[PDB]
Symmetry: C3
Subunit: 148 residues, 3 copies
């Protein structure tokens, strides 16, 4: 059986008067993510991880972020792949993410047509180090397993 | 069969006044990590990720009276992964530290992790990188670990 | 069905007077990457991921930072030897995915060429090799164009 892995990376700046949307979840915060779309850093990293696993290139080559994640899933199936699992990490000094995670995971599992038990979202601070630890941006990392 | 991957990340500040412990190994150095075992946390996180059990923060709170050191948490993690129905297939990882030299300590760390995970030794790998004097890591202000894990149900 | 995964990281400083070589492609640019070898950040990260998947240590173990035979070393040749030691360990490579993070130059026009180089060195079809390119959204030393980073994941099978 023809397994493939992919890995994704994303980061966006924290700016004033933007809403903070991570994993499809709007979170109350003084700042939000700057990007050309809704800047959903978690969903972007997963998207890239999925594109990588199917050897379809990346987010820049192909293109709200949930519609984009859905399209990615469609193009992955187009290529003949099925998604086995997604895992990920959000790196954010603030605000607290713990309470929003199950929701993010539910958003992701819906968009990808996966059962909840095949999707995971983890959260880390940056221990006050670098631009992340200063709350100047937020990073996400993702890993995806697919099979042909 | 029913394979899953997981990935882990971790970082801790590196300052005078503490012992340096990485992958269960104490390392002579003029600094230490605020036990703070980056390598073992990233790997634990990777294992929960693969199992889709959340993360180390949900399982072992900076609160709970039940918790101990990073190898104990790794064992408990492994046991919880087993109960969800997953056997661990392999682990790989990278420590990014500008200093001190990690090469001599690598087989020791791999030995701890394989013991803790109940794996054949040839299923655990640990790599080491500098950050080429770039950023907080390259200035020695902290140390990062990265981990990946394959599991099967 | 004895599958293994690996992951890899690399960074190098971007400096005046050096060739810019990434994924084995020489990119026209006024700066290049600094290292002992040709400092190909992408191939190094992929080499790490392969060594890691096979549990063979890492690129420092196999091709020391200090052995003068690796001065100006072609990193494609290092990747090929890596693939060779992975197969000799009994693994076949199934796929590689990877990411480059760089403020500049534009990497999109060279990405296919990099994928081609990697697929040849690993003896894979193009459709099992993927290369992605990111900016760091202007954050940190990567945003300041001080270095270029790469990440890789590889799946192999015994
Ligand atoms: N920002 C956060 C980092 C880690 N854990 C959280 O719950 N929130
Ligand atoms: N800190 C280290 C960086 C790179 N190699 C080592 O062996 N140790
Ligand atoms: N340096 C680059 C970053 C992102 N995309 C590119 O095409 N190039
Ligand atoms: Cl940038
Ligand atoms: Mg990083
Ligand atoms: Zn993004
Ligand atoms: Zn930690
Ligand atoms: Zn390198």
């Amino acid at each position: 059986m023809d397994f493939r892995i992919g890995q994704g990376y994303d980061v966006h700046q924290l700016v004033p008067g933007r809403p903070l949307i991570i994993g499809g979840v709007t979170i109350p915060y003084e700042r939000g993510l700057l990007g050309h779309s809704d800047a959903d850093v978690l969903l972007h990293a997963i998207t890239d991880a999925l594109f990588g696993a199917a050897a379809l290139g990346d987010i820049g080559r192909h293109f709200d972020s949930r519609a984009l994640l859905r399209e990615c899933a469609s193009r992955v199936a187009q290529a003949g792949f099925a998604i086995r699992n997604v895992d990920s990490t959000i790196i954010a000094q603030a605000p607290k993410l713990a309470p929003h995670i199950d929701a993010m995971r539910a958003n992701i599992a819906a968009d990808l047509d996966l059962p909840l038990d095949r999707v995971n979202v983890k959260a880390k601070t940056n221990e006050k180090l670098g631009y992340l630890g200063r709350g100047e941006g937020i990073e996400a990392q993702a890993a995806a397993l697919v099979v042909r």
